[PDB]
């Protein structure tokens, strides 16, 4: 895909979208449904989904000015144990969350692509670069019909198949 080859530095009205070329020239528009879906999943994740702030008050002493022996050794041990475990949880959690963010945003891109491909049916071919070659004249009203989910492939097959085969 074209979305593997690169992203668009020129797209500022959304995260995912369409770019096109036809007889009326070129243009661009964001897809707001996939943009919002990716955003909602992320905003949820950045919030307190599996963790929250706990309020704590009186606790053990963590710093000492004197050498005491066994009790102090245990208090230090307990605190170091707690820190190592929370530091671990923080590494694993961030790597898992980042792994899921990359995967959900790549998936939203692929979903838009498959969604488009099945709307077009046999009237278009996948060029291997994130683009569909549409085999019939498709003007700006047509491109918007594809973009908003109303493209009717049955009014184009007679032309599109003649151009494909």
């Amino acid at each position: 895909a074209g979305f593997i080859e690169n992203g668009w530095e020129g797209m500022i009205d959304g995260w995912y979208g369409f770019r096109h070329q036809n007889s009326e020239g070129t243009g661009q528009a964001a897809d707001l449904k996939s943009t919002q879906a990716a955003i909602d999943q992320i905003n949820g994740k950045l919030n307190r989904v599996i963790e929250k702030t706990n309020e704590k008050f009186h606790q053990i002493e963590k710093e000492f000015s004197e050498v005491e022996g066994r009790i102090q050794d245990l208090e230090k041990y307990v605190e170091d144990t707690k820190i190592d475990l929370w530091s671990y949880n923080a590494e694993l959690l961030v790597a898992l969350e980042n792994q899921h963010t990359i995967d959900l945003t790549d998936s939203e891109m692929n979903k838009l692509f498959e969604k488009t491909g099945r709307q077009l049916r046999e009237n278009a071919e996948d060029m291997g670069n994130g683009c569909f070659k549409i085999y019939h004249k498709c003007d700006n009203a047509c491109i918007e019909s594809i973009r908003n989910g109303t493209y009717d492939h049955d009014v184009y097959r007679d032309e599109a198949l003649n151009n494909r085969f």
Binding site: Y16, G17, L46, M109
Partner: protein
């Protein structure tokens, strides 16, 4: 025909994050999950912060003349300073740390004077090591009992708890520097102090001898405490060396604590206090300190953790 290209946005300069499969991947945006800095100041809201200026909590508890301003004071967080010092009759507290913890978590120095009657003894003795005003003095919450005339009776006093709360009694034992002091001070070759309740007792035997000189004195006072629950009774028995209670501290439960910090206190609001000052609590983790109070982020070793807030950044080229 026509071409319809699908894609996603990119940014001129993204940021790197770590995943399970990749050590460094560039993304459009990322946020920071570790709070690594403080304001350097402690906020005085929403928590009640009590700056012990030159006092420790125990000196404030006992009644050191420089800590007279903390009588009947309350706090959510008591703050001790490195400049704090004592300036009264030299003392020690066996298990100092536990008494400091009990008082800190109670959250108050509210003190109620009780009608203890000590007969056959001289009440309110002081020292030039604890000056109060221009003359001699002593800790304000303690009563140093000495001989009266030529005698010192065995004191047997009973103080029942007919209230609906726990009473904390602070008392101590005097340790003379010599055999020539203990028999001129409370006319007794071998003193003992016994303090008891219906459930437990503590008996302390004084130890005679010179210690290093502190504020001109080679003698010491040891501080002990007992808690009397509703329905129980406090009994004090002594034949010398009693630094008597003057009443009790009212005990409470709650969110109160203690911290050691040299940070200044200001007019700002923050729910999380560390000894380096207040920090924001809008991130799940912090690496400012391990010692925290209130609604704080978890302490971690990492100075930084980046959480992707967007997709992979793939520049146009």
């Amino acid at each position: 025909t026509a071409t319809l290209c699908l894609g996603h946005h990119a940014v001129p300069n993204g940021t790197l994050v770590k995943t399970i499969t990749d050590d460094q991947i560039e993304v459009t945006n990322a946020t920071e999950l570790v709070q690594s800095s403080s304001t350097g100041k402690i906020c005085n809201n929403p928590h009640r912060i009590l700056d012990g200026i030159d006092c420790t909590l125990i000196d404030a508890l006992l009644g050191d003349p420089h800590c007279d301003v903390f009588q009947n004071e309350t706090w959510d967080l008591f703050v001790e300073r490195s400049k704090a010092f004592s300036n009264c009759y030299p003392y020690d507290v066996p298990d100092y740390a536990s008494l400091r913890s009990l008082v800190a978590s109670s959250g108050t120095l509210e003190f109620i004077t009780e009608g203890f009657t000590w007969t056959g003894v001289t009440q309110n003795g002081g020292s030039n090591a604890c000056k109060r005003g221009p003359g001699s003095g002593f800790f304000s919450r303690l009563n140093w009992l000495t001989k009266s005339g030529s005698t010192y009776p065995v004191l047997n006093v009973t103080m029942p708890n007919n209230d609906n709360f726990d009473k904390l009694y602070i008392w101590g034992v005097h340790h003379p520097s010599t055999n020539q002091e203990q028999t001129s001070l409370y006319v007794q070759a071998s003193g003992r102090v016994t303090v008891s309740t219906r459930r437990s007792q503590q008996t302390i035997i004084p130890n005679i001898g010179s210690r290093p000189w502190v504020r001109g004195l080679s003698s010491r006072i040891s501080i002990y405490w007992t808690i009397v629950k509703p329905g129980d009774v406090l009994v004090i028995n002594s034949n010398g060396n009693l630094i008597a209670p003057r009443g009790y501290f009212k005990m409470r439960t709650g969110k109160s604590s203690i911290m050691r910090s040299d940070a200044p206190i200001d007019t700002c609001i923050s729910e999380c206090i560390t000894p380096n000052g207040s920090i924001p609590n809008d991130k799940p983790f912090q690496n400012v300190n391990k010692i925290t109070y209130g609604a704080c982020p978890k302490y971690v070793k990492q100075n930084t953790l980046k959480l992707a807030t967007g997709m992979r950044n793939v520049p146009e080229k």
